[PDB]
Design a protein around this ligand. Structure first.
Ligand SMILES: Nc1cnc2cc(Cl)ccc2n1
Ligand SMILES: [Mg+2]
Ligand SMILES: [Zn+2]
Length: 313
C-alpha cells in the first residue's frame, strides 16, 4: 500500500508529455503502466498483487506481430494517461480506472489482419460477430482474463460500479473500430458547432470517450518524426502481410496493402493524415483544449511526410 513505482528521472518527466516513447525495454512497460495507474487513479484503485497478475496475463495474450502487439497496448494506454492528466477534473474515478484498462486490453489477441480480411477469409469470428469483428473479440478476451481466479482487479467495486466500468470498457474497445470513428467524429463536430455538446448527457460522454480512444489508438502519428517514421514500417509490415493473404484468396488487395506499390506509401500517409488523423485531433482539441499538443505533433508529422514526397528525404 505504501509501495509506489518510481521511474528514472528522464522517464519520470518525459512520461507526462503526449509524445513520450516507452522505449525498447519490454521489461519496463508493466512498471510504466502501473506507474500511470497509481498517478491517474491512486495507489488504492487496484490491489497490486491482482493488477500485476492481470497485466502479465494481458501481456501473454498479445501476439508477436509487427505492430498490433504488447508495445501498441502500452503506448495507447500512455496516451490515454496523458489525456487524463491534462483534463484532471472532467472524468469520474470509474472512468480513469476503466479507460486505462480499456486501452491496455483494446487489441488483445490481434493477429495483424483487418475486420475485412476476416470477412473475405470466412474466419469463424466473422460468423460470431458481423460488425466490429476483432473489437468484439478483444472485449471478449478482456472479460475472459477478468474471470481468471486471482485476476478480478475490480472485485472491490459494487455490483453497480462493476457494471458501469465493464460498460465503459466495452464501448471504449468497440469505439477503436475505425469504421465507426468517422460518424462518431461527424456527430461530435455538429454537437460542438450547434453548441448542444453536454458532458452530463451520458451518450455525449460515450461519443467523447470514443474519440479519445481513436486519438490514443492512432497516437503513433503524434510522436517525434523518427518514432512516427519507424512505427510506420511496423504498421505497413502487417498491411503487406494482409495484402499477400488477399492475393492468396485470389483478390487484388487495396494498394495500401500491396507490397508491390511501396512507392505510393508517402501519398497514402498524406490521405490518412488528411482523412483521419488531423480531423480526429482537431475535433478532440475543440472538445478538450489541453490535448492540443497531439494536433501540433500530428501536423508536424504531416509536414514531414510532405517532405518525403518532395524528395527532401
Ligand atoms: N495507412 C495507414 C493506416 N493506419 C495508420 C495508423 C497509424 Cl497510427 C499510422 C499510420 C497509418 N497509416
Ligand atoms: Mg484494434
Ligand atoms: Zn490499436
Amino acid at each position: 500500500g505504501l509501495m509506489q513505482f518510481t521511474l528514472p528521472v528522464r522517464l519520470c518527466k518525459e512520461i507526462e508529455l503526449f509524445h513520450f516513447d516507452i522505449g525498447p525495454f519490454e521489461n519496463m512497460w508493466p512498471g510504466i503502466f502501473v506507474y500511470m495507474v497509481h498517478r491517474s487513479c491512486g495507489t488504492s484503485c487496484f490491489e497490486l498483487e491482482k493488477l500485476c497478475r492481470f497485466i502479465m496475463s494481458v501481456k501473454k495474450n498479445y501476439r508477436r506481430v509487427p505492430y498490433h502487439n504488447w508495445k501498441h497496448a502500452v503506448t495507447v494506454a500512455h496516451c490515454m494517461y496523458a489525456i487524463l492528466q491534462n483534463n484532471h477534473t472532467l472524468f469520474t474515478d470509474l472512468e480513469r480506472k476503466g479507460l486505462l484498462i480499456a486501452c491496455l486490453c483494446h487489441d488483445l489477441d490481434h493477429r495483424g489482419f483487418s475486420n475485412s480480411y476476416l470477412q473475405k477469409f470466412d474466419h469463424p469470428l466473422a460468423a460470431l460477430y458481423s460488425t466490429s469483428t476483432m473489437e468484439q473479440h478483444h472485449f471478449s478476451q478482456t472479460v475472459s482474463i477478468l474471470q481468471l481466479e486471482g485476476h478480478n482487479i475490480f472485485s472491490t467495486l459494487s455490483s453497480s460500479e462493476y457494471e458501469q466500468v465493464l460498460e465503459i470498457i466495452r464501448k471504449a474497445i468497440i469505439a477503436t473500430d475505425l469504421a465507426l470513428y468517422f460518424g462518431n467524429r461527424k456527430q461530435l463536430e455538429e454537437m460542438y458547432q450547434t453548441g448542444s455538446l453536454n458532458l452530463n448527457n451520458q451518450s455525449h460522454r460515450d461519443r467523447v470517450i470514443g474519440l479519445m480512444m481513436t486519438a490514443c489508438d492512432l497516437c503513433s502519428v503524434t510522436k517525434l518524426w523518427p518514432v512516427t517514421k519507424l512505427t510506420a514500417n511496423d504498421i505497413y509490415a502487417e498491411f503487406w502481410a494482409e495484402g499477400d493473404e488477399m492475393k492468396k484468396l485470389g483478390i487484388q488487395p487495396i494498394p495500401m496493402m500491396d507490397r508491390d506499390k511501396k512507392d505510393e506509401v508517402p501519398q497514402g500517409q498524406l490521405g490518412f493524415y488528411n482523412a483521419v488523423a488531423i480531423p480526429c485531433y482537431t475535433t478532440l482539441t475543440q472538445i478538450l483544449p489541453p490535448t492540443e499538443p497531439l494536433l501540433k505533433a500530428c501536423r508536424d508529422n504531416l509536414s514531414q511526410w510532405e517532405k518525403v514526397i518532395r524528395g527532401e528525404e
